[PDB]
Nucleic acid binder design. Structure first.
Ligand SMILES: *O[C@H]1CCO[C@@H]1COP(=O)(O)O
Ligand code: NI
Length: 291
DNA sequence: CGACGGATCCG
DNA sequence: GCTGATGCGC
DNA sequence: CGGATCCGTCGGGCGCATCAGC
């Protein structure tokens, strides 16, 4: 059973088709084409993902042979890094772990690479949400965006504080070299990125305030949503809530993105989703960027 | 988080 | 010290 | 009027830190 190949939407369109990674993906590049492969996955507790499947990271390298793996919601403490650092995967010696010191066992991002970055820096310019990694031709920012929560308590903090600082961080990097922004942006951009847009108008993640900041602070600053631009009018989800068993019915959201600067957006070859990989409420997404 | 009614618009 | 029960915020 | 909004409230599943009880 492949529920992601079936189109589930409350207000769909005739031109829309459900994402099928078997058929809707292009084939890999010729052996030797200078490129870089990046994967992103919200693990919803990395210690819980490994208790479920120990080889979750290895089975990604076996299926895609990525160069860089970006993670969100690792829910790791600063003391838990070294033990995970040795038992997650081999051959990726450059792993950087930003953990949350405010709330313990909460949030937490990571960037695990096999190519040595020129420089890595957490935060802008506490909850482990920003990891900027410099490379020979581009920055790579792995981001886990905070949620407004029940009652939209942090909605003003999300719009006037987080989305503004995140945008200014990305543009200051573009002054040097282009940007590949990945991670859990925690926002369903358009109505095609959610199965029930009408029923979540006031729900955190699909509020109009968050959706306008998705365009203003991010896309309208010279950026492209690779998956949407590669597959215009194609429904694909990267999240399914446990509360309603949404993964068995494909009733989900698209919260994980690969936003790439206009400079190198043409060099994007594939922006895919792997909805068959279980172990978390999210599923991994990938990017194949030509160099 | 999304499901499910009651109650407000509203053209 | 180890296992289960509890309360939290996605 | 009556379909299309808005909105009040619950039932709900999970990874973590924490906590007492054995
Ligand atoms: O249920 C979704 C809608 C808004 O945020 C949650 C996703 O939570 P994350 O696990 O992406 O932080
Ligand atoms: Ni989550």
């Amino acid at each position: 059973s492949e529920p992601w190949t079936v189109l589930a939407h409350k207000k769909p369109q005739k031109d829309w088709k459900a994402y099928n990674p078997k058929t809707m993906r292009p084939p890999p590049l010729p052996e030797g084409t200078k490129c870089v492969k990046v994967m992103t996955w919200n693990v919803n507790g990395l210690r819980g993902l490994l208790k479920f499947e120990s080889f979750s990271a290895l089975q990604l390298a076996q299926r895609e042979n990525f160069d860089i793996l970006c993670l969100q919601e690792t829910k790791l403490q600063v003391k838990d890094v070294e033990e995970i650092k040795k038992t997650l995967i081999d051959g990726y010696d450059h792993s950087f772990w930003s953990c949350s010191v405010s709330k313990l066992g909460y949030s937490g991002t990571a960037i695990i690479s096999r190519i040595k970055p020129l420089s890595v820096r957490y935060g802008t310019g506490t909850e482990g949400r920003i990891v900027t990694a410099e490379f020979d031709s581009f920055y790579l920012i792995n981001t886990y965006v905070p949620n407004s929560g029940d009652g939209l308590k942090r909605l003003s903090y999300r719009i006037e504080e987080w989305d503004r600082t995140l945008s200014n961080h990305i543009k200051e990097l573009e002054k040097s070299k282009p940007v590949v922004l990945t991670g859990d942006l925690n926002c369903a951009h358009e109505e095609i990125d959610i199965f029930n847009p009408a029923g979540n108008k006031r729900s955190a993640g699909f509020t109009i305030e968050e959706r306008q900041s998705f365009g203003a602070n991010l896309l309208d600053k010279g950026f492209v949503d690779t998956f949407r631009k590669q597959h215009p009018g194609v429904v694909g989800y990267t999240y399914w809530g446990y509360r309603h068993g949404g993964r068995k019915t494909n009733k989900g959201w698209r919260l994980d993105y690969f936003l790439v600067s206009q400079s190198i957006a043409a060099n994007v070859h594939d922006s895919y989703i792997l909805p068959d990989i279980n172990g978390s409420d999210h599923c991994p997404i990938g990017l194949i960027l030509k160099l």
